[PDB]
Amino acid sequence: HPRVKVGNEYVTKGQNVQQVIYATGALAKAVYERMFNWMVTRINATLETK
Amino acid sequence: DSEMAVFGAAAPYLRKSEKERLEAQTRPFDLKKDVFVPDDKQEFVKAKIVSREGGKVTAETEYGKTVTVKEDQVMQQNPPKFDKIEDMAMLTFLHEPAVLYNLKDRYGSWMIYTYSGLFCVTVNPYKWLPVYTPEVVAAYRGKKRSEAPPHIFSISDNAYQYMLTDRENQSILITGESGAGKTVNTKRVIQYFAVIAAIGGTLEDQIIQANPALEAFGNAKTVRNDNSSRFGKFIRIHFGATGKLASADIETYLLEKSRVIFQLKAERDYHIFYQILSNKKPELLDMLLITNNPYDYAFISQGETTVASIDDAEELMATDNAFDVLGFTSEEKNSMYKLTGAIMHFGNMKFKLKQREEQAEPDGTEEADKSAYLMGLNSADLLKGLCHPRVKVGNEYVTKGQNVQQVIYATGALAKAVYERMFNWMVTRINATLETKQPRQYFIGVLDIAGFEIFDFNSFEQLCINFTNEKLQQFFNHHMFVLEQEEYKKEGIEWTFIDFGMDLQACIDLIEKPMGIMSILEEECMFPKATDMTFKAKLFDNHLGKSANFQKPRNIKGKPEAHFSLIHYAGIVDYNIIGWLQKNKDPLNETVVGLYQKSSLKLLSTLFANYFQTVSALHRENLNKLMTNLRSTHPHFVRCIIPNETKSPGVMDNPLVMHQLRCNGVLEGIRICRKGFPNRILYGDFRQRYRILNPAAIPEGQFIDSRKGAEKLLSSLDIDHNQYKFGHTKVFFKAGLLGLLEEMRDERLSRIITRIQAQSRGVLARMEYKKLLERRDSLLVIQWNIRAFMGVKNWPWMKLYFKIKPLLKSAEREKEMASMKEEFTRLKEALEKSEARRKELEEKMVSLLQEKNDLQLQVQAEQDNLADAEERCDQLIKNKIQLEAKVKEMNERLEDEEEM
Numbered sequence: 001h002p003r004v005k006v007g008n009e010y011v012t013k014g015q016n017v018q019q020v021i022y023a024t025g026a027l028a029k030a031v032y033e034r035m036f037n038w039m040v041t042r043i044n045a046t047l048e049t050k
Numbered sequence: 051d052s053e054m055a056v057f058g059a060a061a062p063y064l065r066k067s068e069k070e071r072l073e074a075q076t077r078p079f080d081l082k083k084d085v086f087v088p089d090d091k092q093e094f095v096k097a098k099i100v101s102r103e104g105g106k107v108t109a110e111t112e113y114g115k116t117v118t119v120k121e122d123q124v125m126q127q128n129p130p131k132f133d134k135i136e137d138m139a140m141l142t143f144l145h146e147p148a149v150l151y152n153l154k155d156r157y158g159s160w161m162i163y164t165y166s167g168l169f170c171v172t173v174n175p176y177k178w179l180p181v182y183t184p185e186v187v188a189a190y191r192g193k194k195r196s197e198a199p200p201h202i203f204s205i206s207d208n209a210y211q212y213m214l215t216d217r218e219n220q221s222i223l224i225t226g227e228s229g230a231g232k233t234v235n236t237k238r239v240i241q242y243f244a245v246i247a248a249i250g251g252t253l254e255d256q257i258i259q260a261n262p263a264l265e266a267f268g269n270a271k272t273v274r275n276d277n278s279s280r281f282g283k284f285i286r287i288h289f290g291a292t293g294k295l296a297s298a299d300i301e302t303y304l305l306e307k308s309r310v311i312f313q314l315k316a317e318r319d320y321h322i323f324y325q326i327l328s329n330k331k332p333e334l335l336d337m338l339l340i341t342n343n344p345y346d347y348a349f350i351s352q353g354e355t356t357v358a359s360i361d362d363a364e365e366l367m368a369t370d371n372a373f374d375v376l377g378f379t380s381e382e383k384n385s386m387y388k389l390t391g392a393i394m395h396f397g398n399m400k401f402k403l404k405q406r407e408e409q410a411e412p413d414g415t416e417e418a419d420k421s422a423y424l425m426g427l428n429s430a431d432l433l434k435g436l437c438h439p440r441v442k443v444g445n446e447y448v449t450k451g452q453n454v455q456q457v458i459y460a461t462g463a464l465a466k467a468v469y470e471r472m473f474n475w476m477v478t479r480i481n482a483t484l485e486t487k488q489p490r491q492y493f494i495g496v497l498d499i500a501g502f503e504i505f506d507f508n509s510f511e512q513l514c515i516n517f518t519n520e521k522l523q524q525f526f527n528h529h530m531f532v533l534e535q536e537e538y539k540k541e542g543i544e545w546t547f548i549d550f551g552m553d554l555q556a557c558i559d560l561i562e563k564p565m566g567i568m569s570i571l572e573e574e575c576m577f578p579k580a581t582d583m584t585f586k587a588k589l590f591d592n593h594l595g596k597s598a599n600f601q602k603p604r605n606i607k608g609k610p611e612a613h614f615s616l617i618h619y620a621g622i623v624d625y626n627i628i629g630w631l632q633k634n635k636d637p638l639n640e641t642v643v644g645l646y647q648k649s650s651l652k653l654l655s656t657l658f659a660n661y662f663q664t665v666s667a668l669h670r671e672n673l674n675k676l677m678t679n680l681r682s683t684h685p686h687f688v689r690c691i692i693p694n695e696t697k698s699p700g701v702m703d704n705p706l707v708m709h710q711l712r713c714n715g716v717l718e719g720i721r722i723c724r725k726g727f728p729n730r731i732l733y734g735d736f737r738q739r740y741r742i743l744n745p746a747a748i749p750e751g752q753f754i755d756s757r758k759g760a761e762k763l764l765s766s767l768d769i770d771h772n773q774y775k776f777g778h779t780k781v782f783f784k785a786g787l788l789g790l791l792e793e794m795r796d797e798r799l800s801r802i803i804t805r806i807q808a809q810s811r812g813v814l815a816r817m818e819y820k821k822l823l824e825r826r827d828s829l830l831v832i833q834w835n836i837r838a839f840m841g842v843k844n845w846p847w848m849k850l851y852f853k854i855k856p857l858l859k860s861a862e863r864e865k866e867m868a869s870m871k872e873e874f875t876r877l878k879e880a881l882e883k884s885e886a887r888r889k890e891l892e893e894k895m896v897s898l899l900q901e902k903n904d905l906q907l908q909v910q911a912e913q914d915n916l917a918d919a920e921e922r923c924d925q926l927i928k929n930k931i932q933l934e935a936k937v938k939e940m941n942e943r944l945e946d947e948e949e950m
């Protein structure tokens with residue numbers, strides 16, 4: 001039941017089993033990819049003897 | 051009870067006195083002999099067993115009458131220790147007389163509210179209790195159903211507690227026939243949220259006025275009630291993440307628009323008209339051309355025009371202030387008053403047959419002139435458009451000449467439409483105020499449907515309102531008896547399905563389905579030559595021998611003009627078929643609606659802006675939308691029961707009360723609440739909320755499945771384990787456990803916030819203790835300093851030389867040490883901090899040098915973004931050019947096909 005905004009209040013939508021599977025995939029990807037780019041940004045935050 | 055003092059003067063009218071507590075233990079009562087027996091004039095009477103004769107029993111009733119009835123129909127009386135209990139789910143013997151007399155003994159002492167387990171029953175006092183002023187609202191703040199005596203404020207706050215805890219929308223579902231009490235309880239809910247939101251501003255007073263502003267335009271005196279809600283209302287009170295009031299939305303479902311033009315004896319039109327007229331307020335009696343008395347306005351003079359329960363002089367001033375508090379400007383308040391004046395004059399327009407055209411014309415126009423002046427319309431254009439309304443057939447428009455008999459209907463429907471949409475706009479404007487654009491996430495939807503009714507003459511509206519009750523009754527039946535056990539099976543609860551017989555799907559289907567009443571109205575309105583006899587004919591052919599609840603009319607009161615009877619849950623209702631096709635089809639005069647859009651009054655144009663979809667279709671889809679939106683919310687039900695037809699306070703008619711107790715399924719609902727598992731928690735929200743009850747049962751920092759965790763925690767609580775069973779995804783509890791768990795949790799939260807305060811005070815006192823000791827030790831050093839001087843006030847050679855400065859190496863060289871060190875150390879500071887500041891600037895220049903170079907590269911990158919964006923727009927325009935050529939050729943060829 002993801003929350004989506006309609007005006008100032010949020011409404012709730014029921015997801016299908018296939019589309020919740022696809023959404024869990026997308027959450028797995030976007031957590032992984034952000035974790036990688038953050039790891040690079042931390043490498044770029046060391047690697048600096050000023 | 052000494053704790054009752056918190057309600058002040060309202061306390062005697064909510065809970066029994068201490069004497070009633072002591073009298074209970076002293077009443078003469080025998081559990082084996084005291085029983086209820088049915089009677090003719092009254093459904094049940096107390097009786098005393100006198101003998102036993104095997105399968106036949108004989109007893110003497112409380113009035114000394116002899117009676118004989120078989121043991122299958124005799125019900126044991128409840129012992130006096132359970133008399134007047136605040137929640138009827140806690141009754142020991144549950145049957146028709148136990149609920150009847152439990153309501154009667156409480157109501158005769160003006161204790162009007164009583165719970166019935168998952169829902170609550172309120173009995174119409176007819177005489178006020180000072181139980182609705184500001185002081186009780188503060189007493190109800192944050193109190194739970196276990197603490198505060200039953201009241202509509204208790205249900206309102208309980209819903210608010212759930213709303214914030216579950217982060218789910220809640221509902222308070224008040225139901226009952228006309229005059230039972232749903233509306234006043236609704237107001238009380240609104241005033242509760244407002245006063246709590248202000249004490250716990252402009253918005254809180256605005257919301258308080260949001261009710262009497264609508265109630266003036268939507269309520270009317272009826273045979274059943276003096277201030278009956280002739281329109282169902284759903285009020286969503288929205289709160290922010292922090293829980294403070296943030297907005298309120300009013301939704302309306304079905305205004306009795308016909309009531310604006312027709313009322314039976316012993317009832318009023320809407321209150322707005324008589325409250326405006328009763329004060330004869332010179333500014334309104336000058337703005338509205340209604341200087342006369344109400345007894346000449348045909349629409350509103352019928353029935354009774356005055357009621358003792360309403361101080362009509364004050365209600366006008368209450369609505370004027372209500373609009374002022376809601377920020378209605380002078381043009382808004384004036385426009386809507388003008389509109390009511392127009393509506394009042396609208397009932398006096400007289401029409402007569404033209405001597406040769408067989409067409410209606412207005413006989414008197416002064417009331418129309420007044421109306422059009424108030425509405426900012428043209429009186430001549432209005433009357434011409436009513437006398438010669440244009441109707442359309444697709445794009446072609448044609449003038450139809452109206453007869454007197456159909457114009458009277460058309461004008462009535464016009465009054466209905468103007469009133470209805472003006473009420474809708476007033477709702478949307480109340481939703482335009484109160485809307486603070488602040489964070490919003492959760493709302494409490496309070497439902498007050500138009501109550502179930504049995505007049506001597508019931509029409510299509512009486513069916514729509516009864517259907518609305520029957521749908522919410524089927525919803526109550528479904529949630530308590532069907533969905534409850536269905537979800538037990540879905541959750542795998544070891545439970546055996548109980549059939550209570552509380553089902554109305556068959557009669558709802560008889561109305562809704564593509565063979566039901568509503569589909570017949572939906573097609574018979576299309577046939578231009580359909581008639582009341584054609585509809586009645588198809589209705590009979592479709593239902594006689596095909597519907598168990600559709601029956602021949604009884605016509606016990608004579609007048610067999612056209613009738614049938616319907617077995618509603620709440621009783622046999624006789625419906626008159628005349629006019630239902632017109633009432634459903636809603637034929638509006640397209641000219642007057644077009645003039646309303648064209649009105650010089652900004653309001654009247656707003657009412658009809660953005661003006662197949664019959665009222666039965668709109669209502670059925672609106673109500674299915676409502677109940678779908680409501681199944682997605684946590685419901686609390688409130689059963690309003692009217693105790694007496696003669697409106698006498700304290701008087702109670704046992705057969706009429708029992709009829710409603712039966713039809714609302716209160717007994718069945720208790721049967722399921724006592725036997726079944728009404729309380730249910732998701733394993734995750736259970737863990738999240740009640741982990742505070744035993745953090746050691748669910749140790750964090752380690753994984754534990756939701757199911758076994760809830761198993762260990764609830765096993766650790768030491769409560770009676772026979773009270774719960776576990777589902778596939780929710781835990782399930784007996785009727786009385788959840789209240790005890792919230793009592794337990796708030797007791798623990800009190801214990802803990804006081805023990806964290808034990809820690810807060812303990813370490814804050816440690817901070818104070820250590821600061822005092824170190825500061826006093828320094829003071830002891832200061833004391834050593836002065837003690838040392840008095841020790842030094844002895845006479846040595848040094849006393850003379852040290853105090854005065856003549857000594858060269860000691861005073862002079864130490865002065866050089868102190869002066870040189872003073873200079874060095876001050877500069878030392880300055881130099882170290884300066885050196886750091888120079889480094890800091892270097893570090894800033896190094897980083898700025900990187901940022902300036904990256905920005906120089908970035909301006910080239912941005913210029914590339916500009917080239918990208920410009921070429922994107924350029925190709926979109928070129929493609930649009932070719933696409934326009936495509937649609938040019940297509941629409942041309944479509945027109946050529948239309949010509950050929």
Ligand SMILES: Nc1ncnc2c1ncn2[C@@H]1O[C@H](COP(=O)(O)OP(=O)(O)O)[C@@H](O)[C@H]1O
Nearest residue numbers: 174228229230231232233234275276277278279
């Ligand atoms: N709780 C109450 N306190 C005082 N009067 C009440 C109460 N309930 C009903 N009434 C009586 O009826 C009216 C309010 O009832 P209401 O809730 O509007 O009934 P319904 O909602 O069934 O139309 C008042 O005018 C009064 O005559």
Ligand SMILES: CC(C)n1c(=O)cc(N[C@@H](C)c2ccccc2)[nH]c1=O
Nearest residue numbers: 211212215216684728729730731735
């Ligand atoms: C079935 C219904 C009455 N219900 C519950 O039985 C419990 C709910 N939520 C839990 C978490 C809670 C318990 C007590 C007060 C607030 C919240 N929600 C619910 O919807």
Ligand SMILES: [Mg+2]
Nearest residue numbers: 232233278279
């Ligand atoms: Mg009402």
